[PDB]
Amino acid sequence: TYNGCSSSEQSALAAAASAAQSYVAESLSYLQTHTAATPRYTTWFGSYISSRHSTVLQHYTDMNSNDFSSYSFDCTCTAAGTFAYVYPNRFGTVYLCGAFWKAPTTGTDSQAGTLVHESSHFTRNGGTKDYAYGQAAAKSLATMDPDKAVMNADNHEYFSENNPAQS
Amino acid sequence: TYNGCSSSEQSALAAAASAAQSYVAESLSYLQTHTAATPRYTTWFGSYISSRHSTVLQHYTDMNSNDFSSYSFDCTCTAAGTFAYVYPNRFGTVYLCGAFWKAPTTGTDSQAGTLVHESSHFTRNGGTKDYAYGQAAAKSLATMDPDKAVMNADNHEYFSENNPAQS
Ligand SMILES: *[C@H]1O[C@H](CO)[C@@H](O)[C@H](O)[C@@H]1O
Ligand SMILES: *[C@H]1O[C@H](CO)[C@@H](O)[C@H](O)[C@@H]1O
Ligand SMILES: [Zn+2]
Ligand SMILES: [Zn+2]
Incomplete structure (x- = not known):
């Protein structure tokens, strides 16, 4: 559903x-399918270890069951x-502001990537926090504090957006 | 008890x-008393999180109740x-070889530290494995795989030997 959204905003949100x-x-x-270290994984989630990989796998397994369009x-x-x-304890509701509309649909810090970011914040999806903001801080967090990286919304957004793309 | 140990080996073992x-x-x-990250803990057990700290705390709780003199x-x-x-499933028995007698009683890779290392291997004390050997590999393991570090014998020995000393 939409609340206070214009025709164009509804179309942008749909996409x-x-x-x-x-x-x-x-x-x-x-x-x-990737159960060993890869560039895309370590860049955003740090050193590959089973427990952390299970953590991120769980987050996406849960987010995948969400209906973003609903x-x-x-x-x-x-x-x-x-x-x-969003409010972590208020599932399925996302509040959009001015900068969202200026962002590209897909790509780095995109509208679609923003929804993945906010979605990860929902307690149902893993309750990620905002320990680091932006690609630079996100990568630094992955390198220095992987445990926080697998619990950081931006690291999830950047792992998904995969731009620049990595294998 | 002692099996094939001279009087000098017996008194050395007692110490x-x-x-x-x-x-x-x-x-x-x-x-x-340390329920938050500190240099001594992170160096040998990696990034601090409750579950991992609980794991090593348990290992030492059990090892502390062991009686090394017996x-x-x-x-x-x-x-x-x-x-x-040692055999993990054969508690309380340690087989010493030639290199043990050349080592110092206390300090890095000491006789006392070796007993800590071997003790951690007993299933009763947690059943640590030998994922890494030596200080360099142990520290690397701590940085790369905290989960394995808290389950690695050498990491326990070095945490206990604490040499060089860290707060
Ligand atoms: C994450 O770090 C690993 C090295 O451990 C690589 O697989 C990748 O290039 C990325 O920098
Ligand atoms: C373990 O790592 C921490 C950094 O996360 C330090 O506080 C400590 O000195 C040790 O290297
Ligand atoms: Zn956020
Ligand atoms: Zn061993």
């Missing part, structure tokens, strides 16, 4: 939700510098 | 066992290239 669904799907498949979207926020926000 | 008991005791106390020591092994060995 972003579908692309977010695909990101999560390809991301889950990747985690299920999320309750709210576009009343007009903050030009904010992308989106 | 090594007393010092090992002291290592395990101090190591347990440390683990009980271990059945066997001195028939004469392999100068190895310190000692």
Whole structure:
């Protein structure tokens, strides 16, 4: 459903939700078939170990079961510098702000990637936190504190967006 | 008891066992009072998280209840290239080889530290494995795979020997 969203915003959300669904799907498949260290994994989740891999696998297994297209979207926020926000304990509802509309549908820090980010925050999906923001801090977190990286929303977004792409 | 141990090997073992008991005791106390990341813990057990700290705490809780002075020591092994060995499912018996007698009572890769290493192998004490050998590999294991570090014998020995000393 939509709340305070214009025709164009609903269309953008429709496209972003579908692309977010695909990101999560390809991301889950990747985690299920890659059970050893790979560039794409270590860059965003650090040194590969079974327990952490299971953690991220679980997050995507859960997010994959979500219906991004059925999320309750709210576009009343007009903050030009904010992308989106959610309440971890209030599942399926995403609040969009001004910066979301200026972001590309797919790619780095995209609308679709933003939904994957926010989705990971839901307690049902793993309850990720925001320990680091942006690709640079996300990669640094992966290198220095992998345990936090597998619990950081941006690291999930960047793992899914995979841009620049890695195997 | 002693199996094939001279009077000099027996008294040396009594000292090594007393010092090992002291290592395990101090190591347990440390683990009980340090419930947050510290250099001594992270160097040998990796990034601090409750579950991992609980694992090593348990190992030392059990090892502390062991009585090293009552271990059945066997001195028939004469392999100068190895310190000692045990069967995980055969508690309380340690087989010492040639290299053990050349080592110092306390310090890095000491007689006391070797007893801590071997003790951790007993299933009753946690059943650690030998994923890495030597300080360099042990530290590397701690940084790359914390889960394996808390289950690696050498990491326990070095945490206990604490040389160089760390807070
Ligand atoms: C993550 O780090 C590993 C090295 O451990 C590589 O597989 C990859 O290139 C990425 O930097
Ligand atoms: C273990 O690693 C931490 C860094 O996460 C340090 O605080 C400590 O000195 C040790 O290297
Ligand atoms: Zn966030
Ligand atoms: Zn061993």
